[PDB]
Amino acid sequence: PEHSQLTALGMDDTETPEPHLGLWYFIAGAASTTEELATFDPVDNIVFNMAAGSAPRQLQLRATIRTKSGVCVPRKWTYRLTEDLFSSSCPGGIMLKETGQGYQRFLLYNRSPHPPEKCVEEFQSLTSCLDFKAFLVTPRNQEACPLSS
Amino acid sequence: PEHSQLTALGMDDTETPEPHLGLWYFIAGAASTTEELATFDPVDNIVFNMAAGSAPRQLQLRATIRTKSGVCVPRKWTYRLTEDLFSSSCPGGIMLKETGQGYQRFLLYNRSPHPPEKCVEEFQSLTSCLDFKAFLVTPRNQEACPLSS
Ligand code: NA
Ligand code: NA
DSSP states (O other), X not given: OOOXXXXXXXXXXXXXXXXXXXXXXXXXXXXXXXGGTGGGTTEEEEEEEEEEOSSTTEEEEEEEEEETTSOEEEEEEEEEEOOOIIIIIOTTEEEEEEEEXXXXXXXXXXXXXXXXXXXXXXXHHHHHHTTOOEEEEOOOOSOOOOOOO | OOOOEEEEEEEOTTOSSOTTSSOEEEEEEXXXXXXXXXXXXXXXXXXXXXXXXXXXXXXXXXXXXXETTSOEEEEEEEEEEOOOIIIIIOTTEEEEEEEETTEEEEEEEESSSSOOTHHHHHHHHHHHHXXXXXXXXXOOOXXXXXXXX
């Protein structure tokens, strides 16, 4: 089972509930090339929940993508899990690193659909610092899409 | 001419003189694997100057490495140049990214042989954040070595 790889890189540890409960939102991505972010160009917003993957060391995201054009695309994604920022800039936040052969991207989620702008700024600033200058912030102009139970 | 690649990633812009004049010191390195830093294990300190490389888009470092065992190894290195941190944490600092096929490392220099410890801490913290957890700080217990003119 070859899946894309997630590594938790840091989070706001004071947020509730634990990560496998409740909803998360997709805020922004940073990568070294535009290709590693292009998949998100049609996205307005993403609401999702994270679950343990039944098989070991696995994460499942159940998502509904709100599209810039206004429609909703439901999605169930399975990943392999790997074997400052959130202290003030990003309350309710989590940053993950997505990895497979030939690609890397950093992904910024939040418990809130509209976190304080200084979160995206600090994430941009930090990733830009280390030369991951391809950057994408979801516009989040539209309502979230329905997501099951 | 295939050389290792340097990209200036940020610097304290208030330091004098311009980078191609005066001396610099090697403070620390961060990479994703120990292999990308192993070359520096025998190092106590490095004093060097940076020069334009006569051929275009090229940088030359003339260095003398003080070795942990106490000796001095002179060095002339030629690189290809690419086509927050320093605002407070690292006065006199510069961070570079060294790159070639199959490897990346971030390199921290300073005008001063012993910058304030909160510089190394912020560089460690920032690189560690983005999952570049192989880390090396030169011990700098010994005197710098002589370097020409
Ligand atoms: Na920087
Ligand atoms: Na972090």
